[PDB]
């Protein structure tokens, strides 16, 4: 096996290399671009905090979910449990180094001060 530069999670929708920009969440088996993260029936874009359903090809929003599955699906309960929905995860930049090379060569003590407010949102 020969090594490759970049990412191994290509966009199964547009068949393009997911690198540098990407800014997407990790899906079940296949990874897709943010711009490519649109509905298969409405072609609309999804936002963080909303629940999405992954169809045979692309993502299908709750707006056309019933009518879409009704035409290309039907009836049939065969398999091993199926009825879960996932929320669109926030984008995480691949450009982030988290290492401690300075504390491994030289040992130094430092004092840090942080202020916390504490409080949750309801409305």
- Chain positions contacting Zn ion, by CB under 5 A: 11, 14, 16, 33, 36, 39, 41-42, 61, 63-64
Give 63 or 72: the residue with its C-beta nearer to Zn ion: 63
Q: How many CA atoms lie within 13 A of 91 on its CB side?
A: 14
The number of angstroms, rounded, from the C-alpha of 46 to the middle of its chain's C-alpha atoms is 11
Cβ–Cβ < 8 Å for 28, 36? no
Q: Indicate the residue among 93 and 120 with the shorter CB distance to Zn ion.
A: 93
- The CB-of-64 to Zn ion minimum distance in angstroms stands at 4
Smallest gap from residue 3 Cβ to Zn ion (A): 24
Question: Of the two residues 27 and 41, which places its CB atom closer to Zn ion in the complex?
Answer: 41
Q: How far is CA 106 from CA 33, 101, 102, 103, 109, in A?
A: 42, 9, 6, 5, 10
We find the least distance from the C-beta atom of residue 42 to Zn ion, in angstroms, to be: 3
């Amino acid at each position: 096996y020969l090594r490759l530069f970049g990412q191994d999670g290509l966009c199964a929708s547009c068949d393009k290399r997911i690198r540098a920009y990407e800014m997407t969440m990790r899906v079940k088996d296949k990874v897709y671009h943010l711009e490519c993260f649109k509905c298969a029936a409405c072609q609309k874009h999804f936002s963080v905090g909303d629940r999405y359903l992954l169809i045979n090809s692309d993502i299908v929003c709750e707006q056309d979910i019933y009518e879409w599955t009704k035409i290309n699906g039907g009836s049939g309960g065969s398999g091993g449990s199926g009825g879960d929905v996932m929320v669109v995860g926030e984008p995480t930049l691949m450009g982030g180094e988290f290492g401690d090379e300075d504390e491994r060569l030289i040992t130094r003590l430092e004092n840090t001060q942080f202020d916390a407010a504490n409080g949750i949102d309801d409305e």
